[PDB]
From a paper:
The human [name] protein belongs to the eukaryotic protein superfamily DUF866 (PF05907), with unknown function. The two CXXC motifs were predicted to play a role of a zinc-binding motif, hence [name] and other DUF866 proteins are likely to be metalloproteins. Functional studies of [name] and its counterpart in S. pombe suggest a role of DUF866 proteins in oxidative phosphorylation in mitochondria.
The final structure with two well-ordered full length [name] (residue 1–160) molecules was refined to Rwork of 0.1754 and Rfree 0.2203 with all backbone dihedral angles falling into the most favoured or allowed regions of the Ramachandran plot, as defined by Molprobity. Structure superimposition using SSM superpose in COOT shows that the two molecules of rC1ORF123 in the asymmetric unit are almost identical with RMSD of 0.45 Å for 160 Cα atoms. Protein interface analysis of the crystal structure of rC1ORF123 using PDBePISA shows that the two molecules of rC1ORF123 in the asymmetric unit of crystal only have a weak contact with an interface area of 598 Å2 (∼7% of a total surface area of rC1ORF123) suggesting that rC1ORF123 is likely not a biological dimer in solution as shown in the SEC analysis that was reported previously. Hence, a zinc ion interacting with the four-cysteine residues was modeled in each monomer of rC1ORF123 structure in the position bridging the loop β3–β4 and the loop β7–β8. We conclude that the zinc ion is likely an endogenous ion bound to the recombinant protein during the protein expression in E. coli cells because both the protein buffers used during the purification and the crystallization reservoir solution did not contain zinc ions. To our surprise, structure examination of [name] shows that the N-terminal half (residues 1–91) and C-terminal half (residues 92–160) of [name] share a very similar fold to each other. Electrostatic potential surface analysis shows that the N-terminal half of [name] has an overall positively charged surface compared to the C-terminal half that has overall negatively charged surface similar to MAL13P1.257 of P. falciparum. In the rC1ORF123 structure, a molecule of glycerol and two water molecules were found in the closed-form cavity of the molecule B while five water molecules were modeled in the open-form cavity of the molecule A. The open-close conformation of the cavity is mediated by two ‘gate mediating’ residues D41 and K68. The glycerol molecule in the closed-form cavity interacts via hydrogen bonds with the main chain O atom of residues M31 and E38, main chain N atom of K68, and a water molecule that hydrogen bonded with the side-chain O atom of N74.
Author numbering: 1 to 160
The structure:
Amino acid sequence: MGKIALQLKATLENITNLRPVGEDFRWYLKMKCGNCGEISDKWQYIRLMDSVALKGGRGSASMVQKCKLCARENSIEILSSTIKPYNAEDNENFKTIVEFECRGLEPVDFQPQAGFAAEGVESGTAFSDINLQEKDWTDYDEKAQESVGIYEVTHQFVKC
Ligand SMILES: [Cl-]
Ligand SMILES: [Zn+2]
C-alpha cells in the first residue's frame, strides 16, 4: 500500500472554489501495475460511487483490476476526505486536490475532463458542468460583468 497525491496547477481568471463535484466524478488516469510496470494503453477512470468491499479485512477500493500481463489483482481507492478545491489564492501554484491509496495500481498520468464546478471570485456566480479536457475553459459572469477562465491546467504526482 502507498498513498499518492495528485496536485493541480492552473491560471485562474475571476474564478474560485474550482472542484470535482459528486460521487460520480470521473478521475481519468493512466495506471501502472506495481508488479510488472505495465501502463494502461487507454485512459481508465475511477469514481467514488464504484466503491467495493475487499475480502478479508483489507478495506475497500474504487477499482480492482486483474493485470493482463502478470495476473496480479491490483486496486486503488480515492480518499474522499482528501478532495480539496483549487481557489483564487492557489493561482499558478501546484496544490493537492485529491489523494489515492494504491494497492498495486499507481497513476502516472491524469486527464481532467468533465464534472468540475467553480464560482465567480466575488459574485459567487455558479459555473457547473465545467469540462477541462482542453486544459482551458472560458465563460462570462453576467453578475460580475467579467470573463471567467481556467487556463494552462497541468498536474503532478507526489508520493506520500
Ligand atoms: Cl475505466
Ligand atoms: Zn502486471
